[PDB]
Structure 1
Amino acid sequence: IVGGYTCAANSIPYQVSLNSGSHFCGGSLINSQWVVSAAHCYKSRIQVRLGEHNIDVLEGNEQFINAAKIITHPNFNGNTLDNDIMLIKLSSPATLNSRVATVSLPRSCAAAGTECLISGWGNTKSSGSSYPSLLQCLKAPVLSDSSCKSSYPGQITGNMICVGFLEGGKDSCQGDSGGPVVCNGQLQGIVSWGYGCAQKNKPGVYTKVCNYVNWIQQTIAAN
């Protein structure tokens, strides 16, 4: 996250870290047994780390559970990043408490201008690399279709929304991928792609979760 702030410890209880020797992507807990992330974060073996704040130190509230099943969307397109969504089933249920909780799925898509909260442990520098140990937060609005499509001509599908600032300086970056965008208590976006990070006129592009509730539900019921 570029141009964010350090989140209060355990103030984003649905945030998870996907680990394969080290942190590589974020995710969101939507059920005690299921985590939603981005398909381009796919890896064969994944350990899901809940209850994290400082990923470099054991604090005592963590629950590390390995992924039992990893299901990428059947229509994910690696070229366009359409349908950039993946579901991970935990080998054992997470225990829900003050530090580990689920985030609601959207009841409807969000209005333009809706204030959201984005979080992750991705790169924090606009020039160079710097991965934080402490979870970062960023408040950003959902941009209209117009501003989103004018920013990326012919590259925005109906399964994508832009969230951020056209002036740059504030955005999600590498390492935040798969992470949550929560607006009014509902998971509206998944960190997906963009042209770089925090560049002017190039806001982050996110998977539009409100189109996938049926797929999520059907998949969880089937597995």
Structure 2
Amino acid sequence: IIGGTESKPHSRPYMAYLEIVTSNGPSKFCGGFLIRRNFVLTAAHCAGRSITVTLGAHNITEEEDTWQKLEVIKQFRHPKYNTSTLHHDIMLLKLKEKASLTLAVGTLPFPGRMCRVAGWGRTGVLKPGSDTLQEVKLRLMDPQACSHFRDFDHNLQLCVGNPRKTKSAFKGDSGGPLLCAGVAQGIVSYGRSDAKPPAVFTRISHYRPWINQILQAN
């Protein structure tokens, strides 16, 4: 998160920190959020060979009793996920156990307006990931403001962030929820490599039928 501020610890108890393993290189990370005691929603571009989820964290380098470290047993990536057009960037992760509900861990059930995104991602173009969960408020834009992304499609995606400001999600914030009036409306998907807003978020409402079908059959 660029241009944001540190979240009050444990004030977003649905936030998941994801550590992604691949076979050919070192670990990477993304965000995501708990929608069921055993299901985390995140972006499909965070897929990997295996993933570990930390719930209940603030400072991700300081282990505490609120932590719940859970294994992911199966990744369900959207079947039409497309790395050419960048569409359908969405994935559910089935947890090996159901998470405990505590004060620090809980689920989040289901243009012009201000919304909030949160993450442990880089705080600057050339900066490391943040140790602590950060958040920022961002303006929802008319779809015209994302025209320069050639494969942007207003039906599938949200255009997020006022170009006149420097506030943005960045690397490591992938998969984090965009909340508008306490409801998850988007997931961080992609933007410019220089972070100039706006950025493109997955529009959660278009994928509700697909979410429901995975959650009902597992």
Give the alignment partner of residue 216 of structure 1, picking from 194, 211, 217: 211
Matches within 5 A, 1:132-151: 132-149=130-147, 151=148
Secondary structure of 2:84's counterpart equals coil
Give the CA deviation at 1:23: 5.6
Give the percent of matched residue pairs that are identical in Structure 1 and Structure 2: 39
Q: Which amino acid aligns with 2:192?
A: Y
Q: What value does the CA root-mean-square deviation take over the aligned residues?
A: 1.4
Q: What's the offset of the Cα at 1:146?
A: 2.0
Between the aligned partners of 1:117 and 1:221, the Cα distance in structure 2 is: 29
Give the 5 Å matches for 1:37-186. Answer: 37-105=42-110, 112-126=111-125, 128-149=126-147, 151-152=148-149, 154-157=150-153, 158-186=155-183
- Residues 44 and 53 (structure 1), Cα distance of their counterparts in 2 relative to 1, 3 Å cut: same
Structure 1 residue identity aligned to 2:12: I
- Tell me, yes or no, if structure 1 residue 7 matches structure 2 residue 4: no
Q: Which runs of 5+ in 1 are unaligned?
A: 106-111
Work out which of the residue numbers 205, 208, 213 in structure 1 matches 2:200. Answer: 205
TM-score (ref. length: structure 1): 0.91
Give the conservation status (yes or no) of the 8 Å contact 2:156–2:203.
yes
Residue number in structure 2 paired with 1:196: 193
Separation (CA, whole Å) in 1 of partners of 2:84 and 2:188: 16
- C-alpha distance in structure 1 between counterparts of 2:83 and 2:6, whole Å: 32
Give the 4+ runs in structure 1 shifted more than 3 A: 20-23
For this pair of structures, how many residues does the alignment match? 212
Contact 1:121 1:133 in 2 (8 A): yes
Q: CA separation of 1:197/1:30 partners in 2, compared to 1, >3 Å: closer, same or farther?
A: farther
Secondary structure of 1:161's counterpart equals strand
Conserved 8 A contact 1:34-1:88: yes
Gaps of 5+ in 2: 22-26
Q: Distance in 2 between matches of 1:168 and 1:155?
A: 23
Shift of the alpha carbon at 1:197? 4.6
